Amino acid sequence: EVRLVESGGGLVKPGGSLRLSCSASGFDFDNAWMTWVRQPPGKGLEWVGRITGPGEGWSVDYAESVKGRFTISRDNTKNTLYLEMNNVRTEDTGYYFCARTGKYYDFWSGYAAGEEYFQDWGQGTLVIVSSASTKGPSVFPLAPSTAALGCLVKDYFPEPVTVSWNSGALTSGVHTFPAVLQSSGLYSLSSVVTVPSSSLGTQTYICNVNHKPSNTKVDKKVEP
Amino acid sequence: ELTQDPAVSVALKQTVTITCRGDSLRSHYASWYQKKPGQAPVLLFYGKNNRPSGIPDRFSGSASGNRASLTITGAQAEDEADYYCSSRDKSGSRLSVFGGGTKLTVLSQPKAAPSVTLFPPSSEELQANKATLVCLISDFYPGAVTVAWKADSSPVKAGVETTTPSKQSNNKYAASSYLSLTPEQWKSHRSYSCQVTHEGSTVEKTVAP
C-alpha cells in the first residue's frame, strides 16, 4: 500500500545539474520525514540527507561529502520529494533511493536521544556522471606466457561491448568478464580464453569487439 | 563511522551473527537493513528490540558496548543478501551514517578456490604511453575476495581498480582488478604481484618485464 517511485535518472556531465523526483502514496506524507540514500554501483549505501515536515521547521541535514552541492526540497501538495544535484561530480554515481524515515521523539530529550530509520524504500533511480558521451574502445592483446590469452578492451562509453573469439567459433574456455568504470568515467574490460599449452600455436585466436553506441568493430589477433 | 566485516558465510539451517562496530553505538541503537541486488532494502530491526511486522522472528538484534549485532537463527536460502547497519555518526548528531555492509552467503555449493591470471601490459599499449596490469579472478565461491597489488614486496595502492564480484554462468563468481601504471613505473621494478585472498587462503600471481 505504501509506494515510493523515484524518477529523473540519467547521464550528466561533471559540473552539470539534475533533479530527482520521488513520488509517494499510501501514507500521510505531510508529516513523514524523508531521506535520500545512494549506492555507488557494486558498493555500499551512503546516507545523502533528510528533510523534515512543516512541524519541525522543514529542517534538513546533509552528509558532509554532499553539503553545499545537493539541495533537498519537497512538494507536499504533490506528494513528491526532490533531490537537486548541482556541481555534480563523478563520485555521485549512481543509484539513488528515497526512504520514509521514522524517528525517536521524547518531549524532554527531543530527538538527540534517539535514532532514525527508513521503514520503506523506493526501487532506485540511476544517475551516471561522466564527461564522455560516446567513445569507441581500444583493444590490446594479452599474450600467453594450461595457457591463457585474451584481449584488453579499454576506455569506452557507454556500455555494452560484446566480445567474441574467432567470429563466434570459439566458445569453450572463453570467459568475458564484467566491465569496470574508472575514475575517469570510462569503462574497461577483458576477455580471456584458456587453452592447453601444446595447442597455443596450432590454432590462431582473434577476438571480435563490437561497441554498438560508437559503431565500432575491432578485430585483434593474439600471438605469443 | 560504522565498521562491518565484508563477508560472512553460513550453512543452511544454522545460526549466524553479523556485527557492526562504531563509537556512536555506545550512545545510540542501530537499525539493520537487508538489500538484495536489484531490489529495495528492507528494515529488519531498529532500536532496543523492535521488529517490523512481516520480518520473521529468526531475525534478532542485540547491542553491547560499541557493538550492534544482528542474528539469524535457522538460516534459509532467502536470507542471502547484503546486510547494513545504520545509526548516528556522533552522539546526539543530526546526521546518520551507514556501515560498509556484509555479504551473507548461505552455502548452496561447495567452497571453490579462485583461479587467478595476471597479464602484463601489452607491447602495443606501452607504445601508446600507457601501462595496465590485468589480474583476472574466476571460478570461486562464495563471491567475496580481497585483492592486494604489490610492487616487489612493497604494497601498491595508487592505480588500483577492482570490480565487485558477479555470478558466472557456472553458478560461481568472477572478478577483475586493474593496476594502471606509467610506462616508466612498469620498467623500473623487478616484479609486480597480484595477490587474491579468499576464505583465509591467499593466491599470488607475479609478472615481470
Numbering used by the authors:
A (entry chain H): 1 to 52, 52A, 52B, 52C, 53 to 82, 82A, 82B, 82C, ...
B (entry chain L): 3 to 9, 11 to 95, 95A, 95B, 95C, 96 to 209
Sentences copied from the publication:
Antibody 10E8 is one of the broadest monoclonal antibodies thus far identified that effectively neutralizes diverse strains of HIV-1. It targets the membrane-proximal external region (MPER) of the HIV-1 viral spike with a highly hydrophobic antigen-binding region. Here we show cis-trans conformational isomerization of the Tyr-Pro-Pro (YPP) motif in the heavy chain 3rd complementarity-determining region (CDR H3) of antibody 10E8 to be the mechanistic basis of its multipeak behavior.
To define the structural basis for the anomalous SEC and HIC behavior, we determined the crystal structures of 10E8v4 with Pro100f to Ala (10E8v4-100fA) in two different space groups, Pro100g to Ala (10E8v4-100gA) and Pro100f and Pro100g to Ala (10E8v4-100fgAA) variant at 3.7 Å, 2.4 Å, 2 Å and 2.7 Å resolutions, respectively. After rigid body refinement, the CDR H3s (95TGKYYDFWFGYPPGEE YFQD102) of the variants were defined clearly in their Fo-Fc maps contoured at 3σ. Extensive hydrogen bonding networks were observed between the CDR H3 and the CDR L1 of 10E8v4, involving heavy chain residues, Tyr98, Ser100c, Pro100g, Gly100h and Glu100i, and light chain residues Ser30, Tyr32, Lys51 and Arg91. However, these hydrogen bonds were not retained in the Pro to Ala variants, suggesting the YPP motif to be critical for coordinating these hydrogen bonds, and disruption of these hydrogen-bonding interactions correlated with the degree that the CDR H3 conformations differed from that of wild type, their reduced binding affinities, and their reduced neutralization potencies. Crystal structures of P100fA, P100gA, P100fgAA and H31LCF variants all showed “open” CDR H3 conformations, which correlated with reduced affinity to gp41, reduced neutralizing potency against select viruses, and reduced affinity to the column matrix. Furthermore, the crystal structures of di-proline variants, 100fA, 100gA and 100fgAA, and light chain variant, His31Phe, revealed how the YPP motif and the hydrogen bonds between the CDR H3 and the CDR L1 contributed to make the alternative conformation of the CDR H3 incompatible with gp41 recognition, providing the structural basis for the reduced binding affinity to the gp41 MPER peptide and the reduced potency against select viruses.
